[PDB]
Amino acid sequence: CKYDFATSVLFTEAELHTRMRGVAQRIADDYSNCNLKPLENPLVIVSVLKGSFVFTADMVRILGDFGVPTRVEFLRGLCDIRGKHVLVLEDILDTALTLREVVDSLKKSEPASIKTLVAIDKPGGRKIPFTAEYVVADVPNVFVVGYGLDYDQSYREVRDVVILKPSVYETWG
Amino acid sequence: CKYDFATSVLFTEAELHTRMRGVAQRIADDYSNCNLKPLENPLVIVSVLKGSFVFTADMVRILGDFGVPTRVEFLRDIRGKHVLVLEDILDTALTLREVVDSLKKSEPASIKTLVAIDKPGGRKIPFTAEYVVADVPNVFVVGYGLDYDQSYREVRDVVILKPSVYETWGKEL
Ligand SMILES: Nc1nc2c(ncn2CCCCCCP(=O)(O)O)c(=O)[nH]1
Ligand SMILES: Nc1nc2c(ncn2CCCCCCP(=O)(O)O)c(=O)[nH]1
Ligand SMILES: [Mg+2]
Ligand SMILES: [Mg+2]
């Protein structure tokens, strides 16, 4: 493997960006009827979990390439969402307990609409039923780091999503 | 100009990244005597101002390429840790002065600052960042995380905003 701390590389930065451009085209199509505009009517991006800064930085730039103007809020997102379209971003979706709570909280402010976009979905991890509208990639029952995802606050800066070696968290634990 | 809301492009994404690679080499050299390591001894990145998520996401990935492992904290467990405060824009220096002086109370091993856009003609107190990606004159810019009323952060380049944008939007408000 390319990294001494990883068993294998699951998604390279380039693979993640190819997938994100595919998702951005779908988002551009799906919101084309909304007359989004900078200042007057941006898509409100609500980024959830500290590590999602990486995904959110890349995704809002790709969305801008596809003609979807945004404004960003971080929950790690309350003022001025009534009547606005909201897209909630999260780097990983596993049990879905966080995103369920966030979406329900935001619904109380009566946005025009709310959808979710996740970089890594672990659908085997659910503790409640939950389907994200947009998913960049799926991961099975494996522990990954990279692309914002940490192990004890390290490895968020790895450009790829990789499986962390057991010998790393075993020694550190 | 490729942007109808801008009168000039000052720094492209590519130019910013070239300059960030130059800075990351200097950081790798300057911190070589700190034996930075993931988990045991990461460089602590303290990202200040909401819009700095873009710079921070790119910069921690570039630092990783140069052998400088990080952990990230956001403002808008550090005693004996090296702290590098990141901010997308340095202007009056009032924010960074306050943040640096606050962090010093927690007895970090060292503290330095790294800014993406320095506007040296904006100072209201004396302040020199240790690392600067690019200097901008006294003009109002957006892009690369920098906003006008929460819009245009997703523009990939740092551009001078067209006066008609804020003259007109100013009258909407
Ligand atoms: N970095 C990392 N974290 C993981 C992994 N599997 C589970 N986690 C905790 C996720 C914490 C955030 C909560 C997300 P929800 O509420 O469970 O959907 C994984 O593979 N990698
Ligand atoms: N978007 C944008 N905002 C600007 C610009 N110049 C000043 N600002 C306010 C700065 C906000 C953060 C505070 C930085 P400090 O405390 O003055 O050093 C500029 O050129 N563009
Ligand atoms: Mg955390
Ligand atoms: Mg703000």
Author numbering:
A (entry chain B): 5 to 80, 100 to 196
B (entry chain A): 5 to 80, 103 to 199
Question: How do the authors describe this structure?
Answer:
In the crystal structures with GMP and 3 a dimer is observed in the asymmetric unit. In the TbrHGPRT.3 complex, 3 adopts two conformations resulting in the phosphonate group occupying alternative positions in the 5′-phosphate binding site. In one of these, the oxygen atoms of the phosphonate moiety form hydrogen bonds with the amide nitrogen atoms of D117 and L120, the amide nitrogen and side chain hydroxyl of T118 and the side chain hydroxyl of T121. In the second conformation, the phosphonate moiety is translated by ~1.8 Å, resulting in the formation of additional hydrogen bonds to the side-chain of E113 and the amide nitrogen of T121, and the removal of hydrogen bonds to the side chain hydroxyl and the amide nitrogen of T118. Three ordered water molecules are also found in or near this pocket. One forms a hydrogen bond with the amide nitrogen of T121 and a second forms a hydrogen bond with the side-chain of D117, thus making indirect links between the enzyme and the inhibitor, while the third water molecule makes networks with the surrounding ordered water molecules. As with GMP, the guanine base of 3 makes a π-π stacking interaction with the aromatic ring of F166, and forms hydrogen bonds to K145, the carbonyl oxygen of V167 and to the backbone carbonyl of D173. A sulphate ion is also present in this structure where the oxygen atoms form interactions with K54 and G55. In this structure, the bond between L53 and K54 is in the trans conformation and the side-chain of L53 is in hydrophobic contact with the carbon atoms of the linker in this ANP. The starting models for the complexes with GMP, IMP, 5 and 6 were based upon the refined model of the complex with 3.
Trypanosoma brucei is the protozoan parasite that is the causative agent of Human African Trypanosomiasis (HAT), also known as African sleeping sickness. However, in T. brucei there are no enzymes for de novo synthesis and this parasite relies solely on its salvage pathways to make its purine nucleoside monophosphates. HGPRT is central to this salvage pathway, as it is responsible for the synthesis of IMP and GMP from hypoxanthine and guanine, respectively. Thus, the crystallographic and SEC-MALLS data agree in demonstrating that TbrHGPRT is dimeric.
